[PDB]
Design a protein around this ligand. Structure first.
Ligand code: SF4
Ligand code: SF4
Ligand code: SF4
Ligand code: SF4
Ligand code: FCO
Ligand code: FCO
Ligand code: F3S
Ligand code: F3S
Ligand SMILES: [Mg+2]
Ligand SMILES: [Mg+2]
Ligand SMILES: [Mg+2]
Ligand SMILES: [Mg+2]
Ligand code: NI
Ligand code: NI
Lengths: 268, 551, 551, 268
């Protein structure tokens, strides 16, 4: 049977958001592209290149008009008429706007496309902005993280396919199943926080007892996400805090890539 | 004759444009162009040195880990910090397991569809295909039944009319030389590769906290708390789990990836005679094992004019000869300052003015070593190891050559390694040797913890005045990486990354000399200028990463 | 005659002693003895009905899940609670996935070494072994290379002089009939089976909260919180993960376990002519799919005197004919009250007086159905399904028979299923059909959630006065299970479990009639009375669980 | 190379503790028996039966005297002179005491052997007791849980093999890496406990938001273990509370099998 079509365009991306798919297990990337979807355009995996792959994109935009899911990773650079990302001689913002016109659903995967992320941090050399900022009249589903657990994306796509609509979203258009709660409001080290049991430096006694990382700069108190529950890589027990390092706030605008690792978070 | 553009080049990381003049059916001149810039060096400027690694790791998510490790090494260099040996073991396991994933994905998901025709695989006899591998491989998933299941997956995809990532591939191109049976073998291995690389990244995740983008580093060591008897930390149960994934990687690497490398060479032997990118090669030693940032498991060095016998060894990441030789130029790049710059004095001032064949045509800078163009990456790293007389490397190369010999009746000499296929071979050799790195460093970690050393982190101090310079070297999947940090009054006053794909993909330099990608393409036969598969074959052999090249 | 004792019988659950009188090398009389008792029925008494399931689940950890499910069903029966359909789907997926694990482990880890000689496997030609399976299986892990790797593992084990679980096995016994190649095939599949059963239990764990011993049930439904959009609960991502493991089970079950069942039968055809334990068979319907504890996907029924054509269907767990017929006696068991007892009036008063051939010799009670001995378990459940004309069951049996016919030239008639091999075949058929149960119920759950039904639990009320009675039936891996609860003044005043291995393994009954294990052994040839492999072959075919039988 | 020998004797066991090994991944059960150890006696898996398997036991007890790890699952019944568990015509307590004489280390796997467990609950029909109670002169390593995560056992064995001594133990002789902390002092639902966000019945709104299960009877506040961190089955996210059901206290004497599911725990 026919599979739902997907068009994936990378802007100012590091490829980590695509790479997250290679860690996924439900579905694995091979089952994703052979069974779950038809990946009609993806430059990292496409056999075709150059003129042939742009032919694929245009054929798919016409054949699947109104039906495909558009996915963008990376920020979109607007400074100097879009020249900081040029594909086939034209600004990526133009490619994305064209693809957005016939999209059934639009997903910003990763913090860069969701809110500008690292590429928009500091002085923002390229005038990088989010996908929603480039598409003001469209509802963009934001799946932030640097990169998110791939199933935050895959279960969003699955909800669209299986039940015919997006999952429930918060007021930043983030799926509530993955971003509905602060990490600190569902973190297994909260007992240590509550008791004042804190690591003060990596390798100290409290650190080696698995105590809370607040005083190392943990941004869990101001970052929405599912890192403490869903965690990463499906092996069990693997997320930054569990390994011994504070959350950096990479999911959350104004936290990750803005505050120093060891800068303390505000607690609600 | 005519002018072609390949834009986008797919099955790489990032945004690449390749232009070629074709004369009499052969590439006579080429341009490589990185078409996306973020300004990551400027984004990290003015911050605390300890924060850089989390930011600059995002230079690239394909070669995740690498910029994080180079960044902490750069700050440790500036600050004169000796990393605890347990932190080195952990950093080394991460880099080796990451690189295993990276190389496997490159050979299969990124490169195989240059050499493999999925349409032809539909015509294969699965039993004949399996029979071809007897006495060539002991891999347990080469049966006719496996190959039939894979063939049926292809069949079903084609029948659906939705070829997706396989649509408009170069099926039936005259440069596709594999028999149907070998095409089917390769597709089966392409799918099997996805399991092996997943296991490699489970190793990375258990020490890094996740991947892509690890989160266990620090200027001064690692954030993993070693405590064999501790709940919730890096204990013996967690280490046993890591080991269970390390052990799963070898069979596929040795029995599938290594063998397929020889198989591709056997069917494409002319590709041992084209794609030479340079006559000079550089690699840095890697996997330090002492308490002073040295005693590397892999050697480094500099080869000039292809002379292995007179190469210059590099045994230290503080080698002043290495440090002083490195500069970058922006004469043909979209930056303002064009004269060669040592990276501690580097600038990155954007100056886009559009494409000009003779002017600026790339966001990639042009690196030189004492004024010469240099190829970096697995070909460089293999040739340096051969120059060093490293028996493990000789022996692993000889294993690939023996399969090639069994299949063709011909042998391979070192002169043939300066080629597209030699570059691919160097990458395979690296992936194989990295499995012993993993076993060695896991054992060293267990042994050292057992001697009672659980130390992982030395807290840094950063003087609030003074100007301090550091450089962090790393032998990344794509070649020598260096991050150059200047600290002034406690904050980053300059940050310059010189990345392996910068060396290889950079445009013509200050003296208009041609870098490796552009040089490698001269002489490439192109049967169909509208479908220049042969050009992409050679470019892919360098494993381009353009987020890395440009940052 | 000669008198032998087999104590302990290994490769079962729990503690079993089998004694046999042998006349001229043929078993003439046998005794089955459960040698360990805990008093789980008394332990759970006088507690809140809601607590029983967590306690009585610990009757057994091989058939984990089963007593938990039967216990909640019994309390729901007593209290008149209709379970939400989503809770049924979840309970059903757990039971079907658990049973897949259970049956696979029984065929391979518990039973195969009765039929398979590892020493002979060392003499096998791995290529010949692989060729034997051409056109018999499409499994992707039957290559000579796989079989050679397995052979070398056995070789290394034997060479070490530490045979461990293989030490002093029945290697070279005259009843070992497989050629070297089939021994090696079976050992390779024994190892591969461990991966498939692990995946089955990943399904169980994701819904149960762990396994062994699930923790997601309740009197009134389940504790899983269904919310497609909820963080930390049973959402779409978690359901997708469950499905990824469900999908991994079918190939091994269909292409390995089902095929090996036919292969063993093809080489041991005399085992279709012995090991008949009874002429009456009972199973209950299973996998309810409505909102009123009914509409079962699998049918149940009662067969008398092997006459499938006149069997009695059972379609309800409230069937009064089923309920009224069940009694247990302790005449030849170590309990005080010997007359047949209906379980709601049952006692379990220990009265150990040592072993006596004609008196008490077991901790297992003797169940009867309207005074008759009855075999339960996969042979019973298959024969009932055939009697019901269930096409899925006839078709699955026909696939096994087709493989057997390809190998022997002969067919199998229903008469031949009343045998040791028929019992093994019924278990394999069950495991195969359970894969469709899993797909069906996963799809049913996804569909129902999509309709807006997220309900999972109906909170019970338990009157603080009055006495009322409930029974929970379940078709467990080893056959019909029933838990019988009497509530008085709000607490458990009686609890009696009548477990499938109780039916099969129970000693001579109130009328000195012989139950299935003991009856099945009459006529067994024993070539070497010091090593009575033939007796253990038939006993293992019933999949004994003595923690279950005795509790 | 030779592998370290293990003798495993089941007393009043349900086999769930052995079955835990079939879920293990590091090592898997096949790598355990072929590479990590030599399993010289285990009635669930051994090819030999009857007189042949008893010969295996006696041969191993001699060949490996002073060298083997003895493992016992299930409680040991003392009532009526041991007759509630008889193997080869003798009380299991006699088999255990004999094998204990030559053991290099002795492990009670599961709550039944660690402290009597379910088999010793209520009226205790068989006078069931713990392994330590039957071996007063020996240091019994207790690995409780019903059953424990198998790696609580396997990493204990590995410590004995790799570093030559037992892991660090608490004052109940439980390995600290697995039992050193209360579940409630490392539980990811502690933020909800702290805020008074509680499920009141299965299926209610708070339950369906993943709130704390204290008021459903969660015994985390009085049970030592690693269920919230190591969890179970190595798939990620799987332990009773994460699935939606309170901890029952199965690790902990006086809690599991004594307190009702819905009876409230004492909080320190
Ligand atoms: S969100 Fe992070 S991983 Fe994804 S493109 Fe941006 S930098 Fe890369
Ligand atoms: S500060 Fe971080 S480690 Fe501590 S409880 Fe909050 S989220 Fe967890
Ligand atoms: S501890 Fe639990 S799983 Fe282990 S024997 Fe006892 S009841 Fe069974
Ligand atoms: S009561 Fe239970 S669920 Fe709530 S925080 Fe404590 S351990 Fe976690
Ligand atoms: N490998 C890699 Fe990325 C590139 N080029 C870096 O460093
Ligand atoms: N299956 C199983 Fe166990 C037995 N007999 C139960 O019920
Ligand atoms: S840094 Fe990112 S990955 Fe999760 S733990 Fe913090 S939001
Ligand atoms: S019941 Fe047991 S398994 Fe853990 S969650 Fe509680 S100690
Ligand atoms: Mg210090
Ligand atoms: Mg740079
Ligand atoms: Mg009738
Ligand atoms: Mg009973
Ligand atoms: Ni890169
Ligand atoms: Ni059982």
């Amino acid at each position: 049977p026919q599979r739902p079509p997907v068009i994936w365009i990378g802007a100012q991306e590091c490829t980590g958001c695509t790479e997250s798919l290679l860690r996924a297990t439900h579905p694995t990337v091979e089952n994703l592209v052979l069974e779950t979807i038809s990946l009609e355009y993806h430059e990292v995996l496409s056999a075709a290149f150059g003129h042939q792959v742009e032919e694929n994109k245009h054929n798919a935009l016409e054949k699947y008009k109104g039906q495909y899911v558009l996915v963008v990773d990376g920020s979109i650079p607007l400074k100097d008429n879009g020249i900081y990302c040029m594909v086939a001689g034209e600004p990526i913002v133009d490619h994305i706007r064209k693809a957005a016109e016939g999209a059934a659903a639009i997903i910003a995967i990763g913090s860069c496309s969701a809110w500008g992320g690292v590429a928009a941090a500091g002085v923002n050399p390229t005038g990088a902005v989010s996908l929603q900022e480039v598409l003001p009249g469209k509802t963009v589903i934001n799946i932030p993280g640097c990169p998110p657990n791939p199933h935050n994306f895959l279960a969003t796509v699955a909800h669209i396919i299986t039940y015919g609509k997006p999952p429930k979203l918060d007021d930043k258009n983030r799926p509530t199943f993955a971003y509905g709660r602060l990490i600190h409001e569902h973190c297994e080290r909260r007992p240590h926080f509550d008791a004042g049991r804190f690591a003060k430096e990596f390798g100290d006694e409290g650190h080696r007892e698995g105590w809370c990382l607040y005083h190392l700069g943990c941004k869990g108190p101001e970052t929405y996400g599912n890192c403490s529950t869903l965690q990463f890589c499906d092996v069990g027990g693997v997320w930054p805090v569990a390994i011994g390092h504070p959350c950096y706030g990479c999911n959350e605008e104004g936290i990750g890539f803005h505050k120093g690792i060891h800068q303390l978070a505000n607690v609600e | 004759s005519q002018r072609i553009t390949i834009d986008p080049v797919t099955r790489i990381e990032g945004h690449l444009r390749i232009d070629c003049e074709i004369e009499n059916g052969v590439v006579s001149k080429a341009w490589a162009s990185g078409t996306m810039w973020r300004g990551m060096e400027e984004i990290v400027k003015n911050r605390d040195p300890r924060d850089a690694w989390m930011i600059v790791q995002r230079i690239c998510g394909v070669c995740t880990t690498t910029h994080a490790l180079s960044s902490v090494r750069a700050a440790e260099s500036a600050l004169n910090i000796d990393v605890p040996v347990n932190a080195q073991y952990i950093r080394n396991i991460i880099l080796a397991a990451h690189t295993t994933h990276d190389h496997i994905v490159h050979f299969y998901q990124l490169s195989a569809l240059d050499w493999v025709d999925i349409t032809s695989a539909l015509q294969a006899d699965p039993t004949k295909a399996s029979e071809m591998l007897k006495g060539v491989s002991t891999w347990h998933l080469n049966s006719p039944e496996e190959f039939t299941k894979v063939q049926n997956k292809i069949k079903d995809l084609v029948a659906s009319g939705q070829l997706g990532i396989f649509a408009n591939g170069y099926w039936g191109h005259p440069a596709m030389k594999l028999p149907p049976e070998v095409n089917l073998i390769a597709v089966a291995h392409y799918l099997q590769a996805l399991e092996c690389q997943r296991d490699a990244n489970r190793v990375v995740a258990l020490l890094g906290g996740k991947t892509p983008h690890i989160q266990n580093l620090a200027v001064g060591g690692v954030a993993n708390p070693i405590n064999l008897d501790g709940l919730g930390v890096l204990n013996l149960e967690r280490l046993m789990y890591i080991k269970s994934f390390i052990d799963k990687l070898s069979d596929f690497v040795e029995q599938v990836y290594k063998v397929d490398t020889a198989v591709i060479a056997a069917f494409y032997p002319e590709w041992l005679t084209r794609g030479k990118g340079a006559v000079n090669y550089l690699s840095v030693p890697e996997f330090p094992t002492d308490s002073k940032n040295g005693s590397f498991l892999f050697p480094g060095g500099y080869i000039e004019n292809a002379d292995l016998s007179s190469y210059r060894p590099i045994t230290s990441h503080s080698d002043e000869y290495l440090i002083k030789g490195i500069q970058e130029s922006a004469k043909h790049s979209w930056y303002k300052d064009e004269a060669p710059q040592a990276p501690w004095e580097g600038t990155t001032i954007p100056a886009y003015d559009g494409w000009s064949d003779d002017g600026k045509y790339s966001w990639v800078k042009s690196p030189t070593f004492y004024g010469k163009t240099v190829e970096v990456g697995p070909l460089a790293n293999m040739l340096v190891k051969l120059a060093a007389g490293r028996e493990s490397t000789q022996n692993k190369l000889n294993e690939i050559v023996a399969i090639y010999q069994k299949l063709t009746g011909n042998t391979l000499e070192v002169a043939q390694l300066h080629s597209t296929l030699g570059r691919i071979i160097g990458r395979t050799v690296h992936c194989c040797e990295l499995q012993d790195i993993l076993q060695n460093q896991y054992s060293a970690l267990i042994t050292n913890i057992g001697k009672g050393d659980h130390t992982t982190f030395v807290k840094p101090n950063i003087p609030a005045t003074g100007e301090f310079k550091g450089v962090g070297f790393l032998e990344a999947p794509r070649g020598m990486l260096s991050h150059w940090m200047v600290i002034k009054d406690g904050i980053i006053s300059n940050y310059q990354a010189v990345v392996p794909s910068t060396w290889n993909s950079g445009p013509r330099n200050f003296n208009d000399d041609v870098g490796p990608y552009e040089q490698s393409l001269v002489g490439t036969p192109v049967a169909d200028p509208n479908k220049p598969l042969e050009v992409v074959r050679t470019i892919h052999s360098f494993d381009p990463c353009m987020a890395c090249a440009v940052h």
